[PDB]
Amino acid sequence: IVDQVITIGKHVKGYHYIIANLGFTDGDLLKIQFGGAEVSGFQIVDYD
Amino acid sequence: NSIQIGGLFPRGADQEYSAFRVGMVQFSTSEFRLTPHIDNLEVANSFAVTNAFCSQFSRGVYAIFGFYDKKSVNTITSFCGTLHVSFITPSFPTDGTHPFVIQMRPDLKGALLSLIEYYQWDKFAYLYDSDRGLSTLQAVLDSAAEKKWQVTAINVGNINNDKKDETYRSLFQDLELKKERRVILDCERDKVNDIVDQVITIGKHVKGYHYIIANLGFTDGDLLKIQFGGAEVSGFQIVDYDDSLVSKFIERWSTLEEKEYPGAHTATIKYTSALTYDAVQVMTEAFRNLRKQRIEISRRGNAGDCLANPAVPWGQGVEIERALKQVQVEGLSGNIKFDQNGKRINYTINIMELKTNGPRKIGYWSEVDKMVLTEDDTSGLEQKTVV
Amino acid sequence: TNAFCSQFSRGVYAIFGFYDKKSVNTITSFCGTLHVSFITPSFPTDGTHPFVIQMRPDLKGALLSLIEYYQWDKFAYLYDSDRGLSTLQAVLDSAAEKKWQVTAINVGNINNDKKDETYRSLFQDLELKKERRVILDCERDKVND
């Protein structure tokens, strides 16, 4: 989905995505990271 | 009849050499055979180029086909002019009138300026690369004075590639002060993909932006990425894949074994490679017009050292020039013709636009007719007004 | 190339001379390969070429500083391609950061056996924007002209 989102360009400022899983950092975010659209999620494994 | 010629191929010119080989086969006749002496050297290094030239000269060649960089170009043009040696090259055209040099690449400077006026641009960004000389940069800058343009020229060349990211972010930061939405990419097929990739990352490939790829290979690069973005992309194509001539070439090219012919198992071909193939045809027709003209030019491998002082030009070279420059055949890059200097004339450059279904020719550019649009108008546009 | 190899065969320890925007690459290359030292008053090389001693200091810096001193935002830049577009790129790149409206014009390729209808057409474009501030980047000769 994230890949498709970037292709159609719906990852720019104005969009807001929420990854509904316990592995937010488990996936590749470097792609929709500089797009502009805000992305939120959940992390169960605190690397801190 | 064995005609020895020189071949200066820069390390990495796989498809170019592959096309050079295919040309040797397609244009091989019983009347005479061409004997290529290949020398793979770093084209950028002026010193190396000097040796490769004097080496091929001592071996006693009749003509030399190779490439040059913005740095070594002066070496070639100079030696070939002094030693009366003919030099055929697909590389960028020389900025001036240098004799004994045959240039396969047509001047894009004209086609570019015409396209700008077509879209009626008054303020645009011009990202250039100093690799092919600032010949086109001066063109747009000088025209910016007459046509009154606000050009934002930026050298995207000296960007160090081992950390080239905080540079692009700071690049489009300046292209946002004036809200630049119209960019002209004057780069190689490689530097273009790098920019295109960055453009998509920052999301400046959506509707509102307009890019112009300032090269003769519009379909040579990957466009599938900025194809559905929304931003309009235009460019130039010299290899018309709609010609039955080119279409037939691809039929055999796309099938060739990629093992023996590196980067040759595709349906397309880089304009640099296509010019190499057309170069072989020009050299063949040239040496053929000398046989039918009853002109003796033959010699041996004892031309001597090129640094010989005083340097005496062999008169047989003057005829070899008048031969190549007189050649006029049909190749992958349209009608091939030359002037007294070596610059191509009476050629055609198709203007391309990138739509949803893919690239599409919207017209062509003639050195005598400027830009001329061809059928394609999506006539009409809901014109169905209300009575 | 001959003059270099000639002086090299004569067995010299160092070479002092000049180069043009065209022959500069020949010198920098040979002197780097043959480890021969080359001292020259000509324009500085655009990069880091070893075995080359340059007497001429880089003006690129002093120029950019002067522009800011007079607080220029819109000016014409008449340049000559004889000493390389090293300074041209300098003002163009800085025009992006400092936000300048530079009108660069190559006053070099002007054929001298009829160079008058060209100058009249030159200051005709420098009047569309009423340019009153010009930077002459040329040799001592092209400047007097």
Contact B151, B140 (CB under 8 A): yes
The secondary structure element, H or E, covering residue C33 is helix C24-33
Residue identified by tokens 């055999």 is: B252
The secondary structure element, H or E, covering residue C6 is helix C2-9
Contact C78, C84 (CB under 8 A): no
Q: State the virtual CA torsion across B333, B335, B339, B345 in degrees, nearest 10.
A: -80
Q: Is B72 on the interface with C (CB under 8 A)?
A: yes
Best A4, A5, A6 residue to mutate vs chain B (most B CBs within 10 Å): A6
Closest-CA distance of chain B to residue A28, Å: 14
User: Taking Cα atoms as reference points, which of B191, B228, B183 lies closest to residue B210?
Assistant: B183
Contacts of B177 (CB under 8 A, 6+ apart): C99
Contacts of C64 (CB under 8 A, 6+ apart): C90, C91, C94
Closest-CA distance of chain B to residue C113, Å: 17
Residue identified by tokens 């001292």 is: C39
Smallest CA–CA distance from B75 into chain C, residue: C26
Chain B residues whose CB is inside 8 A of the C50 CB are none
Residues in chain A: 48
The secondary structure element, H or E, covering residue C143 is helix C140-144
User: Taking Cα atoms as reference points, which of C80, C48, C89 lies closest to residue B157?
Assistant: C89
Q: Is B160 on the interface with A (CB under 8 A)?
A: no
Question: Which 3 state secondary structure label does DSSP give B212?
Answer: strand
Q: Please report how the helices B73-82 and B46-58 are oriented relative to each other, as an axis angle in degrees rounded to 10.
A: 30
For C67-101, b/e burial (b = at least 16 CB within 10 A) is beeeeeeebbbbbbbebbbbbbbbbbbbbbeeebe
Q: Which of C:73-132 have CB within 8 Å of B?
A: 81, 85, 88-89, 92-93, 95-97, 99, 101, 103-106, 125-126, 128-129
d(CA B333, CA B104): 9
What are the helix (H) ranges across C35-75? 60-69
Edge-to-edge order in the sheet of strand B101-103: B33-41, B2-10, B63-66, B86-89, B101-103
Q: What angle do CA B143, B149, B150 make, to 5 degrees?
A: 130
DSSP codes, B160-204: -SSSTTTTTTTHHHHTTTTT--EEEEE--HHHHHHHHHHHHHHTT
DSSP codes, B13-75: -HHHHHHHHHHHHHT--SS-EEEEEEEEE-TT-HHHHHHHHHHHHHTT-SEEEE---TTTHHH
Cα–chain center distance at B215: 7
- The verdict on a CB contact (< 8 Å) between B307 and C25 is no
Contact C135, C76 (CB under 8 A): yes
Strand C74-79, strand C134-137: pairing: parallel
Phi and psi, residue B351, nearest 5°: -85, 125
Closest-CA distance of chain A to residue B357, Å: 15
Cα–chain center distance at B328: 19
Strand B334-335, strand B330-331: pairing: antiparallel
Best C82, C91, C92, C111 residue to mutate vs chain B (most B CBs within 10 Å): C92
Tokens of C136: 């002459």
Contact B144, B150 (CB under 8 A): yes
Closest-CA distance of chain B to residue A13, Å: 9
Contact C44, C3 (CB under 8 A): no
DSSP codes, B244-273: HHHHHHHHHHTTS-TTTSTT--SS---HHH
Closest-CA distance of chain B to residue A38, Å: 14
Question: Which among B201, B205, B206 is the nearest to A34, CB-wise?
Answer: B201
Beta pairing partners, B151? B124
User: Taking Cα atoms as reference points, which of B45, B130, B78 lies closest to residue C25?
Assistant: B45
Tokens of B274: 């296509």
d(CA B351, CA B366): 11
Question: Which among B45, B144, B177 is the nearest to C29, CB-wise?
Answer: B45
Closest-CA distance of chain C to residue B146, Å: 6
Contact B102, B324 (CB under 8 A): yes
Q: Please report how the helices B109-118 and B135-146 are oriented relative to each other, as an axis angle in degrees rounded to 10.
A: 40
Question: Which among B71, B138, B148 is the nearest to C25, CB-wise?
Answer: B71
Method: cryo-EM
Contact B283, B66 (CB under 8 A): no
d(CA C40, CA C17): 5
Q: Please report how the helices B14-26 and B271-291 are oriented relative to each other, as an axis angle in degrees rounded to 10.
A: 30
Contact B306, B79 (CB under 8 A): yes
**Reported structure resolution in angstroms:** 6.8
Contacts of B318 (CB under 8 A, 6+ apart): B84
DSSP codes, B79-90: HHHHTT-EEEE-
Question: Which among C2, C85, C103 is the nearest to B309, CB-wise?
Answer: C2
Edge-to-edge order in the sheet of strand B210-213: B150-155, B123-128, B182-186, B210-213, B232-237, B348-354, B359-366, B370-373
Cα–chain center distance at B52: 22
Peptide bond into B157 cis (omega under 30): no
d(CA B202, CA B212): 18
Contacts of B208 (CB under 8 A, 6+ apart): B181, B230, B231
Contact C44, C58 (CB under 8 A): yes
Subunits with 3+ C-beta pairs closer than 8 A to C: B
Closest-CA distance of chain A to residue B338, Å: 45
Rounded alpha-carbon distances, angstroms, from residue B94 to B50, B157, B259: 18, 20, 35
Contact B166, B105 (CB under 8 A): no
d(CA B136, CA B143): 11
Q: What angle do CA C87, C93, C94 make, to 5 degrees?
A: 90
Question: Which 3 state secondary structure label does DSSP give B334?
Answer: strand
Contact C104, C88 (CB under 8 A): yes
Residue type at B363 in one-letter notation: G
With the C-alpha atoms ordered B163, B169, B173, B175, is the resulting torsion angle positive or negative? Answer: positive
Looking at B83-130, which runs of residues are DSSP E strands?
86-89, 101-103, 123-128
Smallest CA–CA distance from C109 into chain B, residue: B96
The set of long-range contacts for C43-46, using a CB threshold of 8 Å and a minimum separation of 24, is C43/C83, C43/C84, C43/C86, C44/C86, C46/C84, C46/C86
- The verdict on a CB contact (< 8 Å) between C92 and B155 is yes
Q: Which of B:230-259 have CB within 8 Å of A?
A: 230
Rounded alpha-carbon distances, angstroms, from residue C1 to B131, B276, C45: 24, 29, 18
Tokens of B41: 């050297």
d(CA C144, CA B3): 53
Cα–chain center distance at C19: 12
Phi and psi, residue C120, nearest 5°: -65, -35
User: Taking Cα atoms as reference points, which of B14, B8, B68, B95 lies closest to residue B270?
Assistant: B14
Residue type at B103 in one-letter notation: Q
Burial class (CB in 10 A: 0-12, 13-18, 19+), B293: exposed
Question: Which among C26, C85, C128 is the nearest to B134, CB-wise?
Answer: C85
Tokens of C132: 């009153």
Question: Which 3 state secondary structure label does DSSP give C8?
Answer: helix
- The verdict on a CB contact (< 8 Å) between C25 and B150 is no
Contacts of B334 (CB under 8 A, 6+ apart): B238, B240, B243, B347, B348
